[PDB]
């Protein structure tokens, strides 16, 4: 199990390099698996859940990755502490979920990827990388974690 | 190690099935314990209408005895949404990924914001319709699919 961890984080941070994706995307391990985090910018507009057009290339990269592997993966929305209440969104909640629903619906509508194999989690602002008492602080909390759990 | 936890669970599940019992809510939720621990499950009808994820005013009730039960006990709360595979594409839930997932964050957004549940103890799942209770061949197993489960986690 160590070791596998340690070979997968190896060949997804080769994956990263190998594609030109070190701006859009980092690669660490935790107790959950290898996880690729990847900031709202290259995935969504603010407040809103719909995957960009110019963000499919990076989901399509991604799939091409996914496909490699037989992992369960995991999609893991997260926002910052500012409030949302709109029609669409109508809490944190939602958004988060429906960040991490969006991403899992292109891997599987348009790459193909089987549905048996994801799950989608929404964490509204409950995990801060530190806080939400600055902006820089706010901007790193928008964020989805696409983990690759244990094999 | 495992019998300390089992028989712990064991009891736990117990105390949740002597809940539904004393308040009369057997029509409205059922009671279960598998490997993720010990599992609430309320089919769709009694938390929202056909392909919406807005909780219906009067399942507010229902959520509230649920809620009380949840303060007694300290575990982490993982509420799971899940469909059946009819189709949705609307302008609020463009899949079933989409309204599975807003359902489960429906139901936390109001144990958080109503009832004072620390937001940190849940978190939302969406399964969309990966989890057939049986499967999706008939109209009753079809409906049976259409639910929330609320998940204590162990500790």
Known sequence: QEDQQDQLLKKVN???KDNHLKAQMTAKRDERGVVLVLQEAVLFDTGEAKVLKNAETLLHQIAVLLQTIPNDIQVEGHTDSRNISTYRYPSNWELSAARASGVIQYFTSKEKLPSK???????????????????????????????????
């Open 117 to 151: 194999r994801f799950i989608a989690v929404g964490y509204a602002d409950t995990k801060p990388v530190k806080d939400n008492k600055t902006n820089e602080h706010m901007k790193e909390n928008r964020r989805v974690e696409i983990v690759i759990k244990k094999s």
């Open 14 to 16: 080769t994956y990263i």
